[PDB]
Symmetry: D2
Subunit: 106 residues, 4 copies
């Protein structure tokens, strides 16, 4: 539903269901802080310029974060495979040892 | 390193300082943003500036969600490690308990 | 307490607590069968000869069985160490990945 | 291979057929048995034959107990493997559940 959002001296209108209002307010706070930080460190003063740069940075951040998620999953997958591999080893070793028959002399 | 790169976002030219080893990421980010702004435009009085603000809000939210995914992975894995580590201590306890046994005789 | 045990036509007396009587009867059955088996396969017919050979064989069996126990334990110890090693790997990998900070352009 | 070896057990000479690669085990078994019979003798009318019967009973019992140890190890390990394998399937289930998540947007 329609919501008016304030960011960096600007007034936005965003359509947003109630169960996403809180997410919207956080994103507004996040972006507000991003623009204020970007500014104090890059000497750029124009607001439109700042928002293009911030949008670019944050797209790149999202790309990185998505790579991180893939990397986490790929890594833990490998650990799970090793755990599995340790299990079949335990079973192979158990078979090897227990299947030995005690010898006699005659 | 790090020189200005001329980037075209949605009918706007802007300069971004960027080292060569990030250039490819910069090209991909501009491509991602351009596609995002275009798809947003057809979905929605499109002052380009306000359009970029809305795109940036969406990306902020998506980033927050993406970060929650790894947080959620980590939280699950924390439980898995706990269970594994107890199984390990129980195996150690059991190994000790059985190895301690002494055979008896009759006489 | 005193118990009279019958093995291979011979009459033994063995001092044995009640909570070991059942073990004694099994050992008597085990040995009875060992002597009957040893005989059908080695053509030795003297009983005293048979029992010396059986006692020798079974000492060797016990040595082997004790080695088996040591081998089982040593092997499973190694599996436990690998399980442990997989855990610190999961934690090292987690640290490596999660401690990466998303970069920006400016 | 396998020739007769002259073994002395407790004042008795006997021949045991034994290949070279078991000779060392045979020497150790005769040494073990000799020590066993001697320790049993001081503990106990010592017809040597009856003494060997009693030694053999003790060894049979000790063997049964020793075998029970590995049986007991194996039984414990069976439980440990079960717990590990459930942790593994739960990790797989959890990995799937989290990776399936899709980021939402506002507009
Ligand atoms: Cl968007
Ligand atoms: Cl004994």
């Amino acid at each position: 539903q329609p919501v008016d959002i304030q960011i960096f001296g600007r007034s936005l209108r965003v359509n947003c269901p109630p169960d996403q209002r809180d997410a919207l307010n956080q994103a507004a706070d996040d972006l507000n802080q991003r623009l204020q930080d970007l500014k104090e460190r890059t000497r750029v003063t124009n607001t439109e310029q700042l928002v293009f740069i911030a949008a670019l940075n944050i797209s790149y951040e999202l790309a990185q974060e998505k790579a991180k998620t893939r990397d986490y999953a790929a890594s833990m997958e490998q650990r799970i495979r090793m755990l599995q591999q340790t299990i079949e080893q335990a079973l192979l070793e158990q078979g090897r040892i227990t299947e030995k028959t005690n010898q006699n002399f005659e």
